[PDB]
Design a protein around this ligand. Structure first.
Ligand SMILES: CCCCCCC/C=C\CCCCCC(=O)OC[C@@H](O)CO
Ligand SMILES: CCCCCCC/C=C\CCCCCC(=O)OC[C@@H](O)CO
Ligand SMILES: CCCCCCC/C=C\CCCCCC(=O)OC[C@H](O)CO
Ligand SMILES: CCCCCCC/C=C\CCCCCC(=O)OC[C@H](O)CO
Ligand SMILES: CCCCCCC/C=C\CCCCCC(=O)OC[C@H](O)CO
Ligand SMILES: CCCCCCC/C=C\CCCCCC(=O)OC[C@H](O)CO
Ligand SMILES: CCCCCCC/C=C\CCCCCC(=O)OC[C@H](O)CO
Ligand SMILES: CCCCCCC/C=C\CCCCCC(=O)OC[C@H](O)CO
Ligand SMILES: CCCCCCC/C=C\CCCCCC(=O)OC[C@H](O)CO
Ligand SMILES: CCCCCCC/C=C\CCCCCC(=O)OC[C@H](O)CO
Ligand SMILES: CCCCCCC/C=C\CCCCCC(=O)OC[C@H](O)CO
Ligand SMILES: CCCCCCC/C=C\CCCCCC(=O)OC[C@H](O)CO
Ligand SMILES: CCCCCCC/C=C\CCCCCC(=O)OC[C@H](O)CO
Ligand SMILES: CCCCCCC/C=C\CCCCCC(=O)OC[C@H](O)CO
Ligand SMILES: CCCCCCC/C=C\CCCCCC(=O)OC[C@H](O)CO
Ligand SMILES: CCCCCCC/C=C\CCCCCC(=O)OC[C@H](O)CO
Length: 462
């Protein structure tokens, strides 16, 4: 067994671990890469836009994740989704390993967006297919833990590689990480995965094909029309396109939620504060690789080590916190809304903490790296409370997980452009305090939507 679990777990464990290695390896150096392309005159954007790009990239990645489950379940099968998803991710990194500049960015981004949409939701699904069970929750716990190992070592290894041999070599290591994942996935999968997941388990019925096709067509066509009109009237700058993608990412939950919209009416409305809290939390957490990455580079003395390494603090604390929260939930209980609040409070505190060094020491010198260590400590603390990775210690839960992190990232694509040396303290203070307060607002708000909900239930029962 693999820690009391089937050997399929280790196969799937290692597969995701190496995917995460390639992904977060890339995330830890990609913004610095764009900075480098800007300094050499090769990429003609502001650093604000480069920051904005990191954010919308991530948003599209997680948006992709919400439909990959569907594509695998209905059209191509979970097992081919992970494989061809992996292949696309590997090509995405290979594109940046080629001796090119800015021109390869977009191609890279599209491949990894599509590949990650295919791979991430479906590797999770395949974990379930190993069980018919009490082990079922243990296997997911183990899975989640070692997923993070990949996220942990990648900025160290890739970050060192970049320092030594350059960006192109560094990106090629990311490509090799995914490759390793593919080998283990392919040959390990044949041994331990069920053959029926080589096909879709819920294939499109004959009468479902045309309506699906019509819907996809109209969406693509409308999106193309919008872009054509944008170009006709002059709104065709990079930030313009970033704004279009922001709006589309934000519009989706609004339409999805207004769509599902007596007792169940209050349940759907009950989710909305929780969804909004989740979005704000991911907003703060996803700035780790943009705003904190910027602060690391500009405001910390890192003359003696790769500054990309700071991104390891995120998965590090997830692993440090896991055994503790394993005890916490079995020994203890607070409602699901209360959790989302406190988590957003902790994320709020991680930004308020970051306002201190500037307020105290000014912004033109260099502060201790421990400010960042503290900030990641707090925000990850919030992640144990608010994320399903803190629940591990479903499909709708999974898609809403991908969607909320997508929306948070879309929000960041607008917000991180406000961040610079001149605005550092005001930025960290505002969004930090704003987060804490929305954290307090959203807890009492959902509690008493739930309170009124259990009122209507009492009426119907007795
Ligand atoms: C899990 C608990 C949350 C963590 C608590 C937050 C602690 C955050 C920051 C503490 C380090 C602040 C920097 C202290 C320091 O050594 O500054 C020295 C300064 O003079 C430059 O070397
Ligand atoms: C309920 C969820 C809403 C999420 C969107 C929050 C957006 C709030 C404000 C955006 C405009 C920036 C307002 C000025 C500001 O915050 O300054 C901060 C920074 O620019 C430093 O000056
Ligand atoms: C363009 C560069 C990369 C080219 C890809 C090379 C593809 C080589 C062989 C194709 C094998 C397709 C296997 C797909 C698959 O379903 O894998 C499932 C495995 O059996 C384990 O789940
Ligand atoms: C199921 C979709 C399969 C294909 C996904 C769409 C792929 C979209 C773009 C891929 C572009 C790969 C090449 C990019 C590239 O080489 O950029 C280099 C620059 O042109 C300069 O060298
Ligand atoms: C479904 C599409 C998702 C695309 C979102 C990715 C973020 C948007 C754009 C990233 C591309 C950055 C390249 C900028 C650029 O092409 O500038 C011109 C270069 O100088 C070309 O030589
Ligand atoms: C049959 C599978 C093919 C893809 C497997 C993954 C291979 C990924 C990368 C291969 C090695 C990349 C070469 C390194 C490189 O390009 O040097 C960097 C610049 O050219 C110069 O600094
Ligand atoms: C990236 C390509 C553009 C977006 C395509 C999204 C899906 C659009 C239409 C789905 C039609 C595919 C047919 C499904 C299929 O191959 O099997 C048919 C049913 O599973 C059995 O009748
Ligand atoms: C990459 C461009 C694709 C954009 C197509 C617009 C959206 C219409 C169809 C997308 C293909 C099917 C989407 C599946 C879906 O709606 O999700 C359902 C659940 O979230 C999965 O169980
Ligand atoms: C860029 C626009 C994307 C819209 C086109 C995507 C749809 C792609 C193909 C539609 C094919 C119609 C279904 C054909 C099909 O595979 O079903 C056949 C049966 O399953 C064969 O047993
Ligand atoms: C390159 C084409 C760009 C097309 C984007 C147009 C946007 C149109 C419709 C939104 C796409 C559907 C996203 C998937 C989605 O609905 O989320 C899943 C559900 O919310 C949860 O089950
Ligand atoms: C299968 C191919 C995938 C194609 C994905 C369609 C992406 C649709 C919209 C994304 C727009 C991003 C534009 C990126 C870009 O380079 O814009 C820069 C402009 O040249 C601004 O001067
Ligand atoms: C119903 C959800 C509403 C969420 C949107 C609220 C936050 C949106 C914008 C905050 C204002 C500061 C960002 C403005 C900005 O810098 O523009 C971004 C650039 O034009 C794109 O790179
Ligand atoms: C369920 C998905 C529905 C998607 C509908 C969203 C499309 C609605 C409006 C698109 C607005 C056009 C993009 C905005 C834009 O280009 O900003 C302008 C730039 O800032 C120019 O500097
Ligand atoms: C399991 C025990 C957890 C105990 C740690 C609780 C820490 C909570 C709050 C600490 C206050 C954070 C501000 C630190 C600070 O401002 O220091 C000032 C700088 O050191 C100036 O040198
Ligand atoms: C468990 C406690 C976790 C640590 C969080 C402590 C954060 C408390 C207060 C942060 C407020 C920092 C704002 C300072 C400030 O804005 O000063 C203004 C400056 O003068 C700008 O020039
Ligand atoms: C155990 C692996 C941790 C993952 C690597 C994360 C690297 C991020 C920060 C390094 C922490 C450095 C400790 C504090 C320190 O050494 O201060 C040195 C400064 O020069 C003092 O201002």
């Amino acid at each position: 067994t693999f820690f009391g679990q089937p050997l399929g777990l280790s196969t799937l464990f290692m597969t995701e671990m190496w995917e995460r290695f390639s992904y977060y390896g890339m995330r830890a150096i990609l913004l610095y890469y764009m900075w480098f392309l800007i300094s050499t005159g090769d990429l003609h954007i502001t650093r604000a836009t480069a920051a904005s790009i990191m954010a919308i990239y991530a948003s599209m990645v997680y948006l992709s994740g919400t439909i990959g489950g569907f594509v695998a379940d209905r059209i191509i099968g979970a097992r081919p989704a992970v494989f061809w998803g992996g292949v696309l991710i590997m090509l995405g990194h290979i594109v940046l390993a080629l001796p090119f500049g800015a021109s390869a960015l977009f191609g890279s981004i599209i491949l990894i967006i599509i590949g990650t949409g295919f791979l991430k939701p479906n590797v999770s699904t395949l974990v379930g297919t190993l069980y018919d069970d009490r082990r079922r929750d243990a296997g997911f716990s183990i899975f989640v833990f070692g997923i993070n190992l990949g996220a942990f070592i990648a900025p160290l290894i890739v970050g060192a590689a970049q320092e030594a041999a350059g960006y192109h070599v560094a990106f090629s290591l990311a490509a090799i990480g995914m490759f390793i994942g593919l080998l283990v996935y392919y040959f390990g999968g044949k041994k331990t995965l069920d053959p029926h997941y080589l096909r879709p388990t819920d294939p499109l019925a004959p009468e479902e094909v045309k309506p699906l096709l019509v819907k996809v067509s109209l969406a693509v066509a409308g999106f193309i029309a919008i872009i054509v009109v944008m170009n006709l009237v002059g709104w065709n700058s990079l930030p313009a396109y970033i704004n279009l993608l922001t709006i589309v990412a934000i519009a989706i939950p609004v339409f999805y939620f207004a769509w599902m919209i007596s007792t169940e009416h209050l349940r759907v409305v009950s989710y909305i504060p929780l969804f909004i809290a989740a979005v704000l939390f991911w907003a703060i957490e996803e700035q780790g690789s943009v705003v904190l990455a910027t602060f690391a580079a500009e405001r910390v003395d890192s003359s003696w080590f790769p500054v990309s390494w700071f991104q390891s603090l995120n998965p590090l604390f997830i692993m440090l916190y896991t055994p503790f929260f394993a005890w916490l939930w079995t020994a203890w209980q607070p409602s699901s809304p209360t959790k989302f609040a406190v988590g957003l409070m902790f994320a709020g505190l991680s930004f308020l903490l970051m306002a201190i060094p500037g307020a105290l020491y000014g912004t033109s010198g260099k502060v201790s790296p421990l400010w960042l260590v503290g900030s990641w400590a707090l925000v990850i603390l919030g992640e144990m409370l608010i994320s399903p990775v803190g629940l591990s210690v479903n499909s709708q839960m999974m898609s809403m997980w991908f969607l909320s992190s997508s929306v948070g990232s879309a929000l960041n694509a607008q917000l991180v452009t406000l961040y610079n040396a001149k605005s550092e303290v005001a930025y960290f203070s505002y969004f930090g305090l704003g987060s804490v307060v929305l954290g307090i607002v959203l807890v009492f708000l959902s509690k008493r939507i739930q309170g009124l909900m259990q009122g209507v239930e009492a009426e119907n029962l007795y």
